[PDB]
Design a protein around this ligand. Sequence first.
Ligand SMILES: Cc1cc2nc3c(=O)[nH]c(=O)nc-3n(C[C@H](O)[C@H](O)[C@H](O)COP(=O)(O)O)c2cc1C
Ligand code: SF4
Ligand code: SF4
Ligand code: SF4
Ligand code: FES
Ligand code: FES
Ligand SMILES: [Zn+2]
Lengths: 119, 230, 434, 192, 62, 93
Amino acid sequence: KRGEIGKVSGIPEEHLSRKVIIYSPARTATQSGSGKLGKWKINFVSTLKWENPLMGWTSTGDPYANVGDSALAFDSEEAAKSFAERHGWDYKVKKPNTPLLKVKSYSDNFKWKGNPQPE
Amino acid sequence: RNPVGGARVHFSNPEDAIEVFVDGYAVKVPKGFTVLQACEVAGVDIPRFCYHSRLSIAGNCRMCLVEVEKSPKPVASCAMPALPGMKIKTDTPIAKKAREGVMEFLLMNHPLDCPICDQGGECDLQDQSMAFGSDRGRFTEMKRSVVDKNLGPLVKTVMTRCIQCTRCVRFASEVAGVQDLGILGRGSGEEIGTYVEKLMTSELSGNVIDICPVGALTSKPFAFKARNWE
Amino acid sequence: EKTHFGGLKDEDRIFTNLYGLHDPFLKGAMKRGDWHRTKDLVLKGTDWIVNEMKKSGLRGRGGAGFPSGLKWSFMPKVSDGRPSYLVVNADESEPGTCKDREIMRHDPHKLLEGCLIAGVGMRASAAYIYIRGEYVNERLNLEKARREAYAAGLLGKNACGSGYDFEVYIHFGAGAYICGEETALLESLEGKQGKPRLKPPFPANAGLYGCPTTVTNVETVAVSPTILRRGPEWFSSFGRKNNAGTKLFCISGHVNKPCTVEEEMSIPLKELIERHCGGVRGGWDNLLAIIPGGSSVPLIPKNICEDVLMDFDALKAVQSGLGTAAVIVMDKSTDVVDAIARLSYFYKHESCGQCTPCREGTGWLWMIMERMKVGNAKLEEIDMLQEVTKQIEGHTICALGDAAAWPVQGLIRHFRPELERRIRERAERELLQA
Amino acid sequence: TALNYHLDSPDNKPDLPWEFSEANQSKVKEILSYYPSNYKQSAVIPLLDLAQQQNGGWLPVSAMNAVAKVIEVAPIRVYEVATFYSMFNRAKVGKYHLLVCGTTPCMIRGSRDIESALLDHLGVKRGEVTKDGLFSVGEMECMGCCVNAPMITVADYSNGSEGYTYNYFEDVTPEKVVEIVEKLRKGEKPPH
Amino acid sequence: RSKKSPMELISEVPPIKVDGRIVACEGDTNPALGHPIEFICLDLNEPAICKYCGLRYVQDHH
Amino acid sequence: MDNQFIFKYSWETLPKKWVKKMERSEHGNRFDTNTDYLFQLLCFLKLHTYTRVQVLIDICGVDYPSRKRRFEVVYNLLSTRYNSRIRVQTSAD
Ligand SMILES: Cc1cc2nc3c(=O)[nH]c(=O)nc-3n(C[C@H](O)[C@H](O)[C@H](O)COP(=O)(O)O)c2cc1C
Ligand code: SF4
Ligand code: SF4
Ligand code: SF4
Ligand code: FES
Ligand code: FES
Ligand SMILES: [Zn+2]
């Protein structure tokens, strides 16, 4: 809806109907730092990537292969939604999963373990 | 400020919320919430090697040290419970020189096999060394070494590059539910292993690959296949 | 007096039979004043014992220095289902100290009386004595004494004829220096590796088996019964303000006939060395260095060991505290760098490798000081050693890291010029031979 | 030769059956009785020491599993305990385990002089048993005030859990230590 | 010769004899022109293979 | 002229409604003005006696795809006589 900016962008018209996914990438499991969170990106699904039959190089024909990764990063969900809405893409927002901080204490390691009652 | 990583704080008791000063910015946290978690609430990210939010708290590796105004020694923020009205200090010369001093000890016996480490691009040791570390490097003598003992067809182990953070041991003892991995020895030269020929036979036994920060435990099927950036 | 706190009359001493001149079993202890109407002593209740201990000013031995009254008062007054325990730190590691094995070899019933008195003054259902693993004969003798006391109704249910119940068990380690720590003691006694736990979970709230407990030295509890019987006011007379009492000194080193006598608290070092244990070998003229107390404290050179008082605060003001009170003197005939290097190797050997600064820092200290023992290092390595010791100190879990950093700092502060001398002479040799 | 891994050997392997002796069973029960029933893991140190005494001075992997079954814990939790403490040998030692000079309170007085005599009188390196399984040389820790720099230490593993004895000898001499070795060769014990 | 790939060509080099618990491998005799130094604990009876070079080190003693 | 002197004088001399946002630092004096006052501000900076900005270095442009005014055109200027460098930037769409 409201693809006027999409119309005036000048990009090929056939790429204005692409379905896109909006999400905030989660923290990687292999690292414990949280310096790569809170930034939203549009995920064009550049699925088609065949293999060059000369050297095994990965060829592609999708112009949006790495745009959403290398560039085009948004500081908020609203900005990304407004951007996709302005360019007339059928976006689909995926809310991120956030950790739930729980009361954790060192002393919980060392519990009385009850009373040696017969059982 | 907003919590780092979007972490949600669940106040099971609205009345009990002690107010602390992480770096001069007062925040409210419930009972418990060790100094590390209080800083996590206030948007401050503290280095950590032994502390996993899913396992029991251990105090080794002394990397999350911070300075408290009413404390002579730097305290382990990952273990010291929060108290009302603390004046915590993170960006302080004491709390910094603590971190470089600890990480120098961490790196003094680490092997020089970064180009062949399967966790080269996503290692917490080097990523934190670039930020919270001194660039010079002072150690010059001979390092130690540990031989590699096979365990499992899908967990490739190089225990030479293993900081003894005991995270794998706690995971195997608590989450996995099978007690096969333990810490053996005393002093400089303690090893971690099964002490026998047994392999890790558990359904969720492949999670030791991610939970171990350094490249000591890495997946065997993914041995040297690709780097994280590609 | 106040002018000089030196010399006991040999009848004011409380550790009789210290030389093993008489029987150490129940009969000898009974004839020497043990198990003397202890039921009357325990029937005044817990509060009276704690108040008397506070009045007596009994500073905790074993190197901690914490007052015993304050430590005992920390135990809870009401039992919330969890019984309270008592652990006696009989692990006499850190060699050069032989006072605890002498106490348990010759005065076992005194230790049993002290532990019972402590368990009356702290609401402890049972008490555990953790004997060092190497003390096999001592453990067997103390077990015999314990069963002798049990057969006499002195322990067990209805202890000493009163309504109080006390069970005394025996546990022995397997040769680990770190097991002597306050918390690694409880970890080992719980059935796992002896690695210390973090401090904020204090043993007064979660100790042995997750139950509140208090750890006290065997020497500190052995003086508990005699203090109450002889009166707290009498005990406070020996020494000076807030740190009075009688301390056992295990003198050793380059001296002739080293003794292990018990004397006053604020004993002058010169008087103690030159009165009991003859004199330092070669005379006082050499007196290269001396470690006051155990080896876990910084060294004191020749200049500042004169007119020094063997008190906790008096020594602490000299940046070298008093630990187990077993001095090791060094004559000028021997080098000081080699002894400290061997001490650093010992600290590297016994470190339980839990936290990073102690696990790696002690090894680094050993390597650096082995290198400089032959002088094979640059001149700037001394400041590097100082910085490494500063990094190790204060960032560890237990006090062994500080106990390993302190001797190096003591050597550097007082005996630095020897290091430059060795380094320079080795440099001259290297340039002379090609 | 202190290692933290097994590499199964025909002398010690997990499949071998190890059981506490009938005389030692009463001692096992007495040891277990000193601790609450739910906290049976606390008896690991006394049980391991008793098992080492019974076997003859060394702790095989099967004895560790037997102790683990006795206290009902995972066998790794007993491997950790056995490896941590410097009193469980985990490697075969002859009937007598000689212990050699100690640390720096003693090395100040010249501890490290009496080390080669014990080795060349039997022709075996440290940690290696003689041709017959009687003597071995290992390291020790000083009990305390080590005024006599040359000391030796013996462990009577010949009789087993019954005649086990751990004595410390003071003021040892290179010919005196040979005299003690010969005295222990026939069977009689020296005076301490 | 070129019919022998490094896979089957590095295995024909006999293992190095060295005393001690560990050995430092640098690749070339000049440290700057080799690989990063790699201390390996050669305690197992199998030769310990350097991860960079592929050279095998075995303990002469025992 | 000194960088802080340009700061003080220009901020005092300029009409207040022209400059929405302005910044002083070692990197460079910045005048973030509105999109319609840009011509007038440039004319004032070109002709005023104390601030004689005679040469325009370049007209830049930065794309911020996260704000309502996506683009931002930057005008780098130079005063040859007084040896100063001023930077004026606005927001576009
Ligand atoms: C590394 C370390 C080793 C220790 N070893 C002993 C020891 O062998 N014997 C002892 O009585 N105290 C030792 N201590 C001091 C203990 O903390 C002490 O036994 C305990 O705190 C009781 O002290 P108290 O007698 O003042 O109550 C050691 C402390 C540390 C940090
Ligand atoms: S674990 Fe990290 S620091 Fe160690 S070699 Fe691998 S990438 Fe380098
Ligand atoms: S193997 Fe990994 S998880 Fe386990 S202690 Fe070593 S670094 Fe930590
Ligand atoms: S400082 Fe040393 S002895 Fe103390 S807990 Fe840490 S590693 Fe163990
Ligand atoms: S991360 Fe907290 S002490 Fe290791
Ligand atoms: S430790 Fe060997 S003489 Fe005392
Ligand atoms: Zn190599």
